[PDB]
Design a protein around this ligand. Structure first.
Ligand code: CQF
Ligand code: CQF
Lengths: 107, 108
């Protein structure tokens, strides 16, 4: 759809190259990070690599479905990490760009 | 603006009357709730009452400003509360409606 192309080529492109984006470009690897509680706390993991693949393989039926995945990725970050962790500030910054760009999504 | 009317008549109307909205209709009251660390963790409190008042009083200059306030309100909840707190599920339910409606907001 027009909106899904916008989420792909405008929103995600902006978020993907951001300097705070690197932790979000692939799934959280709890083994490599030594976080054995991650998947006990976060039951719906999400990341931009997954969203991007879904956009490219036409997995989404509506823009809102893709926006829901972005939201899950951000709220997973807030739920799991300590308030004082840098990753929380990084997610907040990216999330604000997400909403800013979503406000201009063609309708 | 066209977008701000939409946020007011479609988004806020939908969230304000929701059965899970009541904890979000007023600022978090850390005395009433016995939460002496709340304002040490959450530096930008936000709530639906405030957003609703800002919409009514033409406080916002752009729709993204109003959307950021909704976002801050939900994010505060995810950051402050324990993962297993019911209020997190309530916030998630309301935010999904927020995103669903925002997906159809006018473009200008
Ligand atoms: C997003 C997100 N949400 N929850 C978490 N993650 C996350 C995803 C990836 C990486 C990582 C580390 N290395 N690589 C190649 C990737 C580290 C984290 C977090 N830890 C963290 C994040 C940023 C910094 Cl600067 C230091 C530690 C803890 C788990
Ligand atoms: C939003 C939000 N973000 N952080 C918090 N809040 C929040 C706002 C209002 C009320 C409240 C309680 N009573 N009144 C009249 C109002 C309770 C809470 C949370 N506590 C809570 C929430 C739901 C349930 Cl079912 C039980 C306890 C903890 C603090």
């Amino acid at each position: 759809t027009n909106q899904l192309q916008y989420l792909h080529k405008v929103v995600m492109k902006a978020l993907w190259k951001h300097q705070f984006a690197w932790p979000f470009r692939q799934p959280v690897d709890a083994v490599k990070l030594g976080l054995p509680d991650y998947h006990k706390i976060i039951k719906q993991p999400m990341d931009m690599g997954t969203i991007k693949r879904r956009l490219e393989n036409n997995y989404y039926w509506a823009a809102s479905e893709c926006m829901q995945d972005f939201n899950t990725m951000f709220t997973n970050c807030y739920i799991y990490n300590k308030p004082t962790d840098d990753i929380v500030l990084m997610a907040q910054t990216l999330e604000k760009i997400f909403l800013q760009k979503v406000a201009s999504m063609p309708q």
